[PDB]
């Protein structure tokens, strides 16, 4: 590890340097890369020393072009954990994403997946740049040159954002909400989160959008990646799963939403509505109870606890009721068993979760892919950090899109739920920069 | 008859009301019962006013605290018909099941049966509830209060399903495929359908499972029963035999399978594969020819026809090539003659049929029992409706199981046949609910 810089250069917030370094090094050279923000520290992982591709019908481990093909069966977590342990060489951190569809295996719904459905893509980098307020480090000194050059030459001035109309409903979200309420009335499930895509009808500048979006958000994790033919960025409002080295397992159910960022007065009125609204309280408590039932599969029961029970969590364009559920990983359980037990987040799927997931396969645009999955960092010391992929933008196979959803219960009304998606889309839609 | 509701309240699909009523009425009072869904009408038949028990060693009529015993030999259809007419009183419908083993007599294979093998169980109900999308009628007024209350109380929520492991092969299906293909190679026969049981390691909730499965299937008939020491439910993909009041005989051979339910794009690829595949076309064609030869024994030659020839038929987790073969019942022939000629379904046995049935008795777990037999409704106008018993679950004598099979020809591979069984199990296995 080589120290590049003491402190940040004037006019560089860590997010800004991370985003600038993304544009000036990996984007410039065509490298895959991933930026992961966690507790005031940005890691920029550059280039794919090696990578894993887990699909519904196979597994590939790639080392500088050379492809191992493998089969796998049973649970996708066990295959992925093996492949991660292999490419980490016992020493390197591994980064990437896990798709919503990874979660179907738990509920015996993997028969609904098309051949070759992507489940996960992760890589071990050639190099890591680490940015804090305290400074900038790099794992390999051959990068010091380009880092210093972008520092001294200084900060790109982000263009004005573009405009995206959130109002049209091409995918008939309002009508799909109505199908879901009838299914709930029929007794099929209690709750499902359904989403709508918003197609961005132009090409995006991901690094710049990332930087602007981050100035206007307060997320638990943020990320920007180019990996597996996909670009994506996001302001994750909550962890689906963290496993610490000491064995602590964490999940953060956020459920219950009102608008935020409309001034102190409006935000306080919305908050007071949220905290006293019986429907939001009930659905929050139910979510937390479900989280606790899931985590209990992999932690010691005497260890399980809720911290910051049902507290208001501010997330840019929205504020939410949030709780933190935790426990101590049991003997004979792995970090991947933890992730599988909790995936996909109950708060982005539904209740009971098997029928919720079933409903999403039918009533949401498929696949969800990265949306409502996780962006992950896995560490050689047994660590796992998995941010729930929401408040995010995607670019793949010539399409660029936003995606946001809402929790549907029996009493839900199409128009309220559509408006909720609009509030959530306000975490991204305003900060989108054209690729020019 | 007595109308209960002229229009269901919203959040009452017919299958959900039928399943709820089974739980609320016959399951509470230990009654025999059978639900049969046909063309948008569910009939819930409750309580055994009178019964017929057909076994390999004799026939019993059970009613009014008596049993009358009857001897039969050679071919069971005539004794069953005579007995059904007896318990019908010329005015009641009769419901029940016919086991695979019923079909051995036509081929002089009954000597392979265990003495006392059950062949059929049918009953005339004490009461009938008829449910459609447009209302509920009941044959007995003393049911109206119970039915009215449940309707008002509201349909219960479907509980979360359990996990059944489809991967292991304790019956060595892969090995039995190899035995079959070596037998085919040697010239003993052309084709056989071999199956595997999957044991469910818990007591099932049949009414709840019935409901959840129905939401995820599109069958020609569905059923839920507790009769003759057995519980069963299923989503029949085809009729083995129907006889209409006008004398039309119908059979529906489905043969050739690919996955369905994986989104439009994958389903279209799979469809295009199925309809262009020479192996699937030839086997479908051969099945239709066999069906025509069987039906020709009981219908007028100038009346035989094939409708919807080799059309794709969608059945939840799978789609199939199917055809409808029909004719006009001949003078002197009964509905039972028609059933016997067509039983068991060519598409669930093999080619030639005698050799195929014999190969099933040797190379499949025995008895098949209800699997690949029929669930039947017999009407006093001479009607018969026999759904082929596939895509079903079963419970008897402390054991609960699923069962799925595949058509084996000379070139079949164990891996592909095992995967086919998994695809067909995808119809039911994910929706199985534990009885607590």
mmCIF file of N, CA and C in Angstrom, chain A residues 93-179:
data_model
loop_
_atom_site.group_PDB
_atom_site.id
_atom_site.type_symbol
_atom_site.label_atom_id
_atom_site.label_comp_id
_atom_site.label_asym_id
_atom_site.label_seq_id
_atom_site.Cartn_x
_atom_site.Cartn_y
_atom_site.Cartn_z
ATOM 1 N N UNK A 93 -9.891 -8.689 -1.474
ATOM 2 C CA UNK A 93 -11.308 -8.383 -1.426
ATOM 3 C C UNK A 93 -11.962 -8.656 -2.777
ATOM 4 N N UNK A 94 -13.243 -9.024 -2.729
ATOM 5 C CA UNK A 94 -14.039 -9.351 -3.900
ATOM 6 C C UNK A 94 -15.298 -8.483 -3.894
ATOM 7 N N UNK A 95 -15.673 -7.978 -5.071
ATOM 8 C CA UNK A 95 -16.771 -7.040 -5.193
ATOM 9 C C UNK A 95 -17.698 -7.473 -6.317
ATOM 10 N N UNK A 96 -18.956 -7.023 -6.245
ATOM 11 C CA UNK A 96 -19.839 -7.201 -7.381
ATOM 12 C C UNK A 96 -21.306 -7.065 -7.003
ATOM 13 N N UNK A 97 -22.148 -7.798 -7.732
ATOM 14 C CA UNK A 97 -23.580 -7.739 -7.517
ATOM 15 C C UNK A 97 -24.221 -9.123 -7.560
ATOM 16 N N UNK A 98 -25.367 -9.206 -6.879
ATOM 17 C CA UNK A 98 -26.210 -10.390 -6.848
ATOM 18 C C UNK A 98 -27.607 -9.949 -7.295
ATOM 19 N N UNK A 99 -28.159 -10.661 -8.279
ATOM 20 C CA UNK A 99 -29.457 -10.350 -8.855
ATOM 21 C C UNK A 99 -30.584 -10.830 -7.947
ATOM 22 N N UNK A 100 -31.732 -10.149 -8.043
ATOM 23 C CA UNK A 100 -32.965 -10.576 -7.397
ATOM 24 C C UNK A 100 -33.177 -12.086 -7.554
ATOM 25 N N UNK A 101 -32.958 -12.587 -8.764
ATOM 26 C CA UNK A 101 -33.322 -13.946 -9.125
ATOM 27 C C UNK A 101 -32.516 -14.977 -8.320
ATOM 28 N N UNK A 102 -31.374 -14.576 -7.744
ATOM 29 C CA UNK A 102 -30.616 -15.443 -6.849
ATOM 30 C C UNK A 102 -31.499 -15.935 -5.704
ATOM 31 N N UNK A 103 -32.475 -15.108 -5.325
ATOM 32 C CA UNK A 103 -33.355 -15.407 -4.215
ATOM 33 C C UNK A 103 -34.442 -16.445 -4.502
ATOM 34 N N UNK A 104 -34.630 -16.863 -5.767
ATOM 35 C CA UNK A 104 -35.728 -17.770 -6.101
ATOM 36 C C UNK A 104 -35.469 -19.186 -5.566
ATOM 37 N N UNK A 105 -34.191 -19.539 -5.347
ATOM 38 C CA UNK A 105 -33.804 -20.912 -5.050
ATOM 39 C C UNK A 105 -34.328 -21.319 -3.671
ATOM 40 N N UNK A 106 -34.308 -20.370 -2.733
ATOM 41 C CA UNK A 106 -34.797 -20.572 -1.377
ATOM 42 C C UNK A 106 -36.270 -20.991 -1.393
ATOM 43 N N UNK A 107 -37.050 -20.495 -2.358
ATOM 44 C CA UNK A 107 -38.489 -20.711 -2.353
ATOM 45 C C UNK A 107 -38.905 -21.712 -3.415
ATOM 46 N N UNK A 108 -37.931 -22.431 -3.980
ATOM 47 C CA UNK A 108 -38.173 -23.520 -4.918
ATOM 48 C C UNK A 108 -38.833 -22.991 -6.189
ATOM 49 N N UNK A 109 -38.458 -21.768 -6.575
ATOM 50 C CA UNK A 109 -39.069 -21.087 -7.710
ATOM 51 C C UNK A 109 -38.085 -20.960 -8.875
ATOM 52 N N UNK A 110 -36.925 -21.630 -8.791
ATOM 53 C CA UNK A 110 -35.888 -21.488 -9.804
ATOM 54 C C UNK A 110 -36.315 -22.068 -11.157
ATOM 55 N N UNK A 111 -37.368 -22.889 -11.187
ATOM 56 C CA UNK A 111 -37.944 -23.365 -12.443
ATOM 57 C C UNK A 111 -38.500 -22.219 -13.307
ATOM 58 N N UNK A 112 -38.767 -21.046 -12.705
ATOM 59 C CA UNK A 112 -39.326 -19.890 -13.398
ATOM 60 C C UNK A 112 -38.249 -19.040 -14.085
ATOM 61 N N UNK A 113 -36.985 -19.426 -13.940
ATOM 62 C CA UNK A 113 -35.880 -18.670 -14.502
ATOM 63 C C UNK A 113 -35.582 -19.166 -15.908
ATOM 64 N N UNK A 114 -35.411 -18.218 -16.832
ATOM 65 C CA UNK A 114 -35.031 -18.522 -18.200
ATOM 66 C C UNK A 114 -33.628 -19.111 -18.208
ATOM 67 N N UNK A 115 -33.286 -19.963 -19.194
ATOM 68 C CA UNK A 115 -31.914 -20.434 -19.351
ATOM 69 C C UNK A 115 -30.949 -19.250 -19.333
ATOM 70 N N UNK A 116 -29.816 -19.417 -18.650
ATOM 71 C CA UNK A 116 -28.753 -18.424 -18.623
ATOM 72 C C UNK A 116 -29.099 -17.152 -17.844
ATOM 73 N N UNK A 117 -30.023 -17.215 -16.881
ATOM 74 C CA UNK A 117 -30.353 -16.029 -16.112
ATOM 75 C C UNK A 117 -29.186 -15.683 -15.193
ATOM 76 N N UNK A 118 -28.626 -14.456 -15.252
ATOM 77 C CA UNK A 118 -27.536 -14.069 -14.360
ATOM 78 C C UNK A 118 -27.998 -14.020 -12.906
ATOM 79 N N UNK A 119 -27.195 -14.613 -12.012
ATOM 80 C CA UNK A 119 -27.477 -14.628 -10.587
ATOM 81 C C UNK A 119 -26.502 -13.726 -9.837
ATOM 82 N N UNK A 120 -25.229 -13.717 -10.248
ATOM 83 C CA UNK A 120 -24.208 -12.915 -9.589
ATOM 84 C C UNK A 120 -23.013 -12.714 -10.516
ATOM 85 N N UNK A 121 -22.319 -11.584 -10.334
ATOM 86 C CA UNK A 121 -21.057 -11.299 -11.005
ATOM 87 C C UNK A 121 -20.168 -10.612 -9.985
ATOM 88 N N UNK A 122 -18.993 -11.189 -9.737
ATOM 89 C CA UNK A 122 -18.058 -10.603 -8.797
ATOM 90 C C UNK A 122 -16.650 -10.710 -9.376
ATOM 91 N N UNK A 123 -15.737 -9.895 -8.861
ATOM 92 C CA UNK A 123 -14.376 -9.904 -9.346
ATOM 93 C C UNK A 123 -13.434 -9.541 -8.204
ATOM 94 N N UNK A 124 -12.186 -10.003 -8.333
ATOM 95 C CA UNK A 124 -11.052 -9.525 -7.557
ATOM 96 C C UNK A 124 -10.291 -8.514 -8.401
ATOM 97 N N UNK A 125 -10.052 -7.287 -7.895
ATOM 98 C CA UNK A 125 -9.419 -6.250 -8.704
ATOM 99 C C UNK A 125 -7.912 -6.425 -8.907
ATOM 100 N N UNK A 126 -7.391 -5.772 -9.950
ATOM 101 C CA UNK A 126 -5.957 -5.614 -10.118
ATOM 102 C C UNK A 126 -5.435 -4.655 -9.060
ATOM 103 N N UNK A 127 -6.210 -3.614 -8.775
ATOM 104 C CA UNK A 127 -5.760 -2.606 -7.838
ATOM 105 C C UNK A 127 -6.956 -1.994 -7.128
ATOM 106 N N UNK A 128 -6.670 -1.460 -5.943
ATOM 107 C CA UNK A 128 -7.651 -0.747 -5.156
ATOM 108 C C UNK A 128 -7.097 0.629 -4.829
ATOM 109 N N UNK A 129 -7.967 1.627 -4.995
ATOM 110 C CA UNK A 129 -7.747 2.964 -4.481
ATOM 111 C C UNK A 129 -8.678 3.143 -3.287
ATOM 112 N N UNK A 130 -8.140 3.634 -2.165
ATOM 113 C CA UNK A 130 -8.952 3.845 -0.980
ATOM 114 C C UNK A 130 -8.950 5.328 -0.615
ATOM 115 N N UNK A 131 -10.154 5.905 -0.561
ATOM 116 C CA UNK A 131 -10.337 7.321 -0.316
ATOM 117 C C UNK A 131 -11.108 7.506 0.985
ATOM 118 N N UNK A 132 -10.493 8.239 1.914
ATOM 119 C CA UNK A 132 -11.170 8.757 3.086
ATOM 120 C C UNK A 132 -10.931 10.259 3.148
ATOM 121 N N UNK A 133 -11.532 10.884 4.162
ATOM 122 C CA UNK A 133 -11.222 12.254 4.529
ATOM 123 C C UNK A 133 -9.744 12.370 4.908
ATOM 124 N N UNK A 134 -9.202 11.322 5.545
ATOM 125 C CA UNK A 134 -7.810 11.291 5.978
ATOM 126 C C UNK A 134 -6.827 11.189 4.808
ATOM 127 N N UNK A 135 -7.266 10.736 3.630
ATOM 128 C CA UNK A 135 -6.367 10.713 2.490
ATOM 129 C C UNK A 135 -6.727 9.664 1.444
ATOM 130 N N UNK A 136 -5.741 9.394 0.580
ATOM 131 C CA UNK A 136 -5.885 8.536 -0.581
ATOM 132 C C UNK A 136 -4.704 7.570 -0.612
ATOM 133 N N UNK A 137 -5.006 6.263 -0.618
ATOM 134 C CA UNK A 137 -4.014 5.206 -0.758
ATOM 135 C C UNK A 137 -4.284 4.389 -2.015
ATOM 136 N N UNK A 138 -3.267 3.643 -2.451
ATOM 137 C CA UNK A 138 -3.403 2.776 -3.606
ATOM 138 C C UNK A 138 -2.519 1.553 -3.396
ATOM 139 N N UNK A 139 -3.048 0.392 -3.800
ATOM 140 C CA UNK A 139 -2.418 -0.893 -3.534
ATOM 141 C C UNK A 139 -1.163 -1.078 -4.389
ATOM 142 N N UNK A 140 -1.027 -0.282 -5.453
ATOM 143 C CA UNK A 140 0.045 -0.469 -6.418
ATOM 144 C C UNK A 140 0.540 0.908 -6.874
ATOM 145 N N UNK A 141 1.852 1.139 -6.738
ATOM 146 C CA UNK A 141 2.439 2.459 -6.916
ATOM 147 C C UNK A 141 2.397 2.907 -8.380
ATOM 148 N N UNK A 142 2.261 1.963 -9.316
ATOM 149 C CA UNK A 142 2.186 2.303 -10.729
ATOM 150 C C UNK A 142 0.946 3.137 -11.056
ATOM 151 N N UNK A 143 0.066 3.372 -10.074
ATOM 152 C CA UNK A 143 -1.140 4.161 -10.293
ATOM 153 C C UNK A 143 -0.968 5.567 -9.736
ATOM 154 N N UNK A 144 0.086 5.776 -8.945
ATOM 155 C CA UNK A 144 0.297 7.044 -8.266
ATOM 156 C C UNK A 144 0.344 8.183 -9.285
ATOM 157 N N UNK A 145 0.929 7.897 -10.453
ATOM 158 C CA UNK A 145 1.106 8.880 -11.504
ATOM 159 C C UNK A 145 -0.248 9.456 -11.907
ATOM 160 N N UNK A 146 -1.163 8.595 -12.365
ATOM 161 C CA UNK A 146 -2.437 9.052 -12.895
ATOM 162 C C UNK A 146 -3.307 9.667 -11.798
ATOM 163 N N UNK A 147 -3.176 9.182 -10.555
ATOM 164 C CA UNK A 147 -3.985 9.694 -9.457
ATOM 165 C C UNK A 147 -3.577 11.143 -9.202
ATOM 166 N N UNK A 148 -2.263 11.371 -9.062
ATOM 167 C CA UNK A 148 -1.732 12.698 -8.775
ATOM 168 C C UNK A 148 -2.127 13.672 -9.879
ATOM 169 N N UNK A 149 -2.063 13.203 -11.131
ATOM 170 C CA UNK A 149 -2.327 14.023 -12.305
ATOM 171 C C UNK A 149 -3.778 14.509 -12.299
ATOM 172 N N UNK A 150 -4.727 13.650 -11.894
ATOM 173 C CA UNK A 150 -6.125 14.049 -11.828
ATOM 174 C C UNK A 150 -6.369 14.942 -10.616
ATOM 175 N N UNK A 151 -5.572 14.752 -9.556
ATOM 176 C CA UNK A 151 -5.699 15.582 -8.371
ATOM 177 C C UNK A 151 -5.277 17.011 -8.712
ATOM 178 N N UNK A 152 -4.069 17.156 -9.272
ATOM 179 C CA UNK A 152 -3.472 18.462 -9.511
ATOM 180 C C UNK A 152 -4.238 19.187 -10.613
ATOM 181 N N UNK A 153 -4.535 18.476 -11.710
ATOM 182 C CA UNK A 153 -5.296 19.053 -12.809
ATOM 183 C C UNK A 153 -6.707 19.390 -12.327
ATOM 184 N N UNK A 154 -7.230 18.593 -11.387
ATOM 185 C CA UNK A 154 -8.354 19.006 -10.564
ATOM 186 C C UNK A 154 -9.695 18.461 -11.050
ATOM 187 N N UNK A 155 -10.761 19.044 -10.485
ATOM 188 C CA UNK A 155 -12.089 18.454 -10.461
ATOM 189 C C UNK A 155 -12.884 18.880 -11.698
ATOM 190 N N UNK A 156 -13.357 17.928 -12.534
ATOM 191 C CA UNK A 156 -14.412 18.223 -13.508
ATOM 192 C C UNK A 156 -15.582 18.999 -12.895
ATOM 193 N N UNK A 157 -16.091 20.002 -13.619
ATOM 194 C CA UNK A 157 -17.258 20.744 -13.169
ATOM 195 C C UNK A 157 -18.509 20.087 -13.745
ATOM 196 N N UNK A 158 -19.315 19.462 -12.874
ATOM 197 C CA UNK A 158 -20.415 18.617 -13.318
ATOM 198 C C UNK A 158 -21.380 19.471 -14.140
ATOM 199 N N UNK A 159 -21.798 19.024 -15.345
ATOM 200 C CA UNK A 159 -22.846 19.711 -16.098
ATOM 201 C C UNK A 159 -24.166 19.818 -15.341
ATOM 202 N N UNK A 160 -25.059 20.675 -15.843
ATOM 203 C CA UNK A 160 -26.429 20.730 -15.368
ATOM 204 C C UNK A 160 -27.086 19.397 -15.677
ATOM 205 N N UNK A 161 -27.925 18.839 -14.772
ATOM 206 C CA UNK A 161 -28.636 17.591 -15.052
ATOM 207 C C UNK A 161 -29.666 17.739 -16.164
ATOM 208 N N UNK A 162 -30.068 16.598 -16.730
ATOM 209 C CA UNK A 162 -31.088 16.532 -17.757
ATOM 210 C C UNK A 162 -32.453 16.387 -17.093
ATOM 211 N N UNK A 163 -33.490 16.250 -17.912
ATOM 212 C CA UNK A 163 -34.857 16.240 -17.440
ATOM 213 C C UNK A 163 -35.480 14.908 -17.827
ATOM 214 N N UNK A 164 -36.174 14.259 -16.882
ATOM 215 C CA UNK A 164 -36.843 12.998 -17.159
ATOM 216 C C UNK A 164 -38.275 13.086 -16.642
ATOM 217 N N UNK A 165 -39.217 12.769 -17.523
ATOM 218 C CA UNK A 165 -40.626 12.811 -17.196
ATOM 219 C C UNK A 165 -40.976 11.521 -16.463
ATOM 220 N N UNK A 166 -41.434 11.666 -15.213
ATOM 221 C CA UNK A 166 -41.767 10.541 -14.354
ATOM 222 C C UNK A 166 -43.252 10.199 -14.469
ATOM 223 N N UNK A 167 -44.034 11.047 -15.159
ATOM 224 C CA UNK A 167 -45.490 11.008 -15.098
ATOM 225 C C UNK A 167 -46.088 9.885 -15.944
ATOM 226 N N UNK A 168 -45.571 9.560 -17.149
ATOM 227 C CA UNK A 168 -46.175 8.501 -17.961
ATOM 228 C C UNK A 168 -46.081 7.127 -17.305
ATOM 229 N N UNK A 169 -46.986 6.223 -17.702
ATOM 230 C CA UNK A 169 -47.101 4.904 -17.108
ATOM 231 C C UNK A 169 -47.157 3.840 -18.207
ATOM 232 N N UNK A 170 -46.132 3.737 -19.083
ATOM 233 C CA UNK A 170 -46.180 2.784 -20.196
ATOM 234 C C UNK A 170 -46.392 1.330 -19.775
ATOM 235 N N UNK A 171 -45.824 0.931 -18.619
ATOM 236 C CA UNK A 171 -45.901 -0.445 -18.147
ATOM 237 C C UNK A 171 -47.130 -0.686 -17.271
ATOM 238 N N UNK A 172 -48.030 0.305 -17.173
ATOM 239 C CA UNK A 172 -49.309 0.169 -16.480
ATOM 240 C C UNK A 172 -49.095 -0.258 -15.021
ATOM 241 N N UNK A 173 -48.236 0.469 -14.310
ATOM 242 C CA UNK A 173 -48.068 0.256 -12.883
ATOM 243 C C UNK A 173 -49.429 0.319 -12.184
ATOM 244 N N UNK A 174 -50.238 1.342 -12.501
ATOM 245 C CA UNK A 174 -51.491 1.539 -11.781
ATOM 246 C C UNK A 174 -52.371 0.298 -11.911
ATOM 247 N N UNK A 175 -52.399 -0.315 -13.095
ATOM 248 C CA UNK A 175 -53.236 -1.485 -13.315
ATOM 249 C C UNK A 175 -52.696 -2.733 -12.618
ATOM 250 N N UNK A 176 -51.361 -2.838 -12.518
ATOM 251 C CA UNK A 176 -50.725 -4.000 -11.910
ATOM 252 C C UNK A 176 -50.933 -3.967 -10.391
ATOM 253 N N UNK A 177 -50.961 -2.752 -9.824
ATOM 254 C CA UNK A 177 -51.301 -2.561 -8.420
ATOM 255 C C UNK A 177 -52.682 -3.159 -8.153
ATOM 256 N N UNK A 178 -53.618 -2.945 -9.088
ATOM 257 C CA UNK A 178 -54.967 -3.486 -8.992
ATOM 258 C C UNK A 178 -55.033 -5.013 -9.079
ATOM 259 N N UNK A 179 -54.179 -5.630 -9.902
ATOM 260 C CA UNK A 179 -54.112 -7.085 -9.938
ATOM 261 C C UNK A 179 -53.650 -7.589 -8.566
#
